[PDB]
Amino acid sequence: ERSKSLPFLMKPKNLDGSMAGDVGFDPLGLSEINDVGVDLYWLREAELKHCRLGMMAAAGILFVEILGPAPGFPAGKSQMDVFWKVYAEKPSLIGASLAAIAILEVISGVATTQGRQNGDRAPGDYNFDPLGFGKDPAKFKDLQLKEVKNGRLAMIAAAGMILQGVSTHQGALENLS
C-alpha cells in the first residue's frame, strides 16, 4: 500500500509494477493526470524520449571534450559555445539536422497518439532493434531497466552540463577540475 521509494507515501494508483524503473516515486501524483492529452502513456513516452536525448547529449559532450572534435570541426571545449562556431561556418548542417529532427518528431507524436488510441504499442517503442539485442524476454526487462536508469542519470547530467556551459562558459571536465 505504501510506495517502495517513499515509505511515508501511499502507492501511486497508476504505477503498479509494470514500467521499468518503477519504485513508486510519484509524490505529486502526476501519474494520475488524464487531461490535455496527458496520461501515464504520454508521460512515459516523454520520459523515455528525455532519457534517450539526455544519453545522446551527455555522450556527445563527453566524447567531444575528451577525444576532441572530428576533423574539420571547431574546437574550444565549451560545448554550449562551440555550437555557434559550427553554425557560423556550417549552417546547412544545423538546418538539415533540425529539419530531420522535426520530421522524426512529428512521426513520433503521431505514433504516440495512435498507440495510445488503439493500444498495441508500448510507450517509447519504435521497433528499433536492428542488431537484435532485445529479441528474447527475460533480457528485455533488464535492458529496459538499464536504459531507464542510464537515461535518468544522463538527463540529470545533460541538464547540469547545459547549465554549466551557459553560466561558466567553460568545459564540463574543465568545471570538474
Binding site: 517513499l6 515509505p7 511515508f8 507515501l9 501511499m10 509524490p27 505529486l28 501524483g29
Partner: protein, 185 residues
C-alpha cells in the same frame, strides 16, 4: 491540565499526541482552519475529509525542532572553526556567512534542494490530510534501526519534541545575542 493548572485544557489536547502536557494558554489547537489548504488551496479530492489544526501544528513543531537542532549545531560549528574542506569558505562567522554565500550562488542551490525535500514531505502531509495512517512527523526514517522497541520509540519521540523546543529557544537566543558563549556581540 498538567501545566498552567488554572486553565482546564484547550479542547483537543486529550493526550493522543506524544510530549503532551496540556500547555496551550491561547487555545491555538482549536482553529477550525485546515492548514493543508495552504498547500492544496481547493478540496481537490472528494476523499479529502480534512486535517485537524492540531496535527498540522504537531507536524510543524516537529519540523521546527529538527530545523532548529540542525541550525544550532551548524551555528556552533562555525563559531569554533570547522570549515568545509574546499575554497571560498574561509572564516566569515555566522552573522555574515549567510549573506556572502547568498551572493555566491550556493544558498540558492541549498534553497532548491531543501524545497525539493520539503515538497516531497509536504505531499506526505497532504496524503495524511487525505486520510493516510501516517502520523505527524513520521517519515519512516530509521536507517540505523534505533527505533524499534515501541517504548524506546515513544521515549525518543518525547525526547525529540522536547529537544526541538529547547533548540528553537536556544537558536532564538543565539541569533539574538549574536553568540556569547563562543564569540562576541
Amino acid at each position: 491540565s498538567k501545566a498552567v493548572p488554572f486553565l482546564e485544557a484547550p479542547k483537543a489536547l486529550d493526550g493522543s499526541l506524544p510530549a503532551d502536557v496540556g500547555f496551550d494558554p491561547l487555545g491555538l489547537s482549536d482553529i477550525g482552519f485546515d492548514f493543508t489548504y495552504l498547500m492544496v488551496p481547493t478540496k481537490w479530492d472528494e476523499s479529502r475529509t480534512g486535517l485537524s489544526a492540531l496535527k498540522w501544528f504537531r507536524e510543524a513543531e516537529i519540523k521546527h525542532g529538527r530545523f532548529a537542532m540542525l541550525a544550532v549545531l551548524g551555528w556552533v560549528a562555525v563559531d569554533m572553526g570547522l570549515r568545509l574542506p574546499v575554497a571560498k569558505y574561509a572564516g566569515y562567522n555566522a552573522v555574515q556567512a549567510h549573506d556572502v554565500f547568498v551572493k555566491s550562488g550556493d544558498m540558492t542551490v541549498g534553497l532548491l534542494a531543501i524545497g525539493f525535500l520539503e515538497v516531497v514531505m509536504g505531499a506526505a502531509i497532504y496524503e495524511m490530510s487525505k486520510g493516510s495512517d501516517r502520523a505527524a512527523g513520521e517519515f519512516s526514517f530509521d536507517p540505523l534501526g534505533l527505533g524499534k522497541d515501541p517504548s524506546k520509540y515513544a521515549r525518543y519521540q518525547v525526547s525529540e519534541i522536547k529537544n526541538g523546543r529547547l533548540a528553537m529557544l536556544a537558536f532564538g537566543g543565539i541569533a539574538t545575542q549574536a553568540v556569547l558563549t563562543n564569540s562576541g556581540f
